[PDB]
Symmetry: C5
């Protein structure tokens, strides 16, 4: 049921510690809102941290992303993300599609 | 009571260990002074880490920020911060505003 | 059997906490999929952190890498990455070639 | 006796793990040399980390920094630093001159 | 028996977790090879980390370094490093020079 989103331009990066709305969020050029995952323990805290790095990276640089998201929230929750440099003819990678065409 | 500040251009980043006045601080083009939140434990240490990350990116590159600030202290504390790209975006995002106007 | 792959251009960088696929992955302009290595404890958490930084950096800039990946599985796990600025003709360092060819 | 140095251009940055000489230092264009404070605990370990990040930012990009250092030892220890975007360049923020003219 | 190295243009940043060759390495344009120092505990875990940030910045930007490395072992491990700009020379700072003739 995991949803693939492709070629998102992230334009807004949000840190928020207000209760009932804490966590990190991104906003798409078209106003898609997603929440970034989070994790205390190894090994996901590695990946959730790199989610934050990647997300910042796009908003700062204009770079595109590809998201494996859950439309079982609102804002949705980013379950995996791919950062892509300019000059890539294709959008998402085949390896990235396949992994989310599974959960 | 939370304030909402928009299209702030941050010009300065301050680290301070002098007694009382210790913490992180950002100063806007208009001379406005805010204090970056902090926390020791999971999960907010992540958000306040990214909060520190966003304040530098803004300062180092000039991108605009939107903040949910508590006016209850001087300088005001930052409770949420939204880093926004030069692709405009109509100022602050609705997702941000919605959560600043809800406390 | 750890092979040496020279002069890669990486165009995608992937965080993923999908179960049974969770990890860091890099993709070449050509499609090659690799899995960044991962480690909990000192001293290799410092190294896997630095390939993560090296992965991200090659993605953002376009500078080549040279890798030392294990063909033992798919995608090939990365055991030793080496970044390189645009000097000479993007060759792999003799030091790195040799250390790679000793497993 | 705390001192306020303004508009400094940091052109060098030293990590050094040789005994007693160990610690982190910055050097201006004039050869003036300062020492970054250290701390092991929350929250000052946040602020000293941000101090180091500021110092590396200036050196890399040659932006100026204002410093609040303690003359009681040599090199001076930085008790507060302020990284400033190129543009305002009006000296230090009033806020930062006022916190160091009270210790 | 420590040995100052000045004006070193680093061209290659290396992470490696292969057994009996793991660590962090840098390589100069001429082809010289140093190990980056590692450390687990406070405070050298701060200095070693900055050491690694300094490499991830000179390889990236072409900025020159100065080194104090121990010839006591294979790829002489770096005991101190100075990230500098290219203003005029630059040389090394006297502060750095005077710290190196120590061990």
């Amino acid at each position: 049921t995991a949803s693939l989103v492709e070629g998102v331009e992230l334009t807004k990066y949000i840190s928020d510690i207000n209760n009932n709305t804490d966590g990190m969020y991104v906003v798409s050029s078209t106003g898609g809102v997603w929440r970034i995952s989070r994790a205390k323990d190894y090994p996901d805290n590695v990946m959730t941290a790199e989610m934050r790095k990647i997300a910042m990276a796009a908003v700062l640089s204009g770079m595109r992303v590809n998201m494996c998201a859950s439309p079982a929230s609102s804002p949705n929750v980013i379950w995996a993300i791919e950062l892509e440099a300019e000059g890539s003819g294709s959008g998402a990678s085949q390896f990235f599609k396949d992994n989310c065409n599974r959960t």
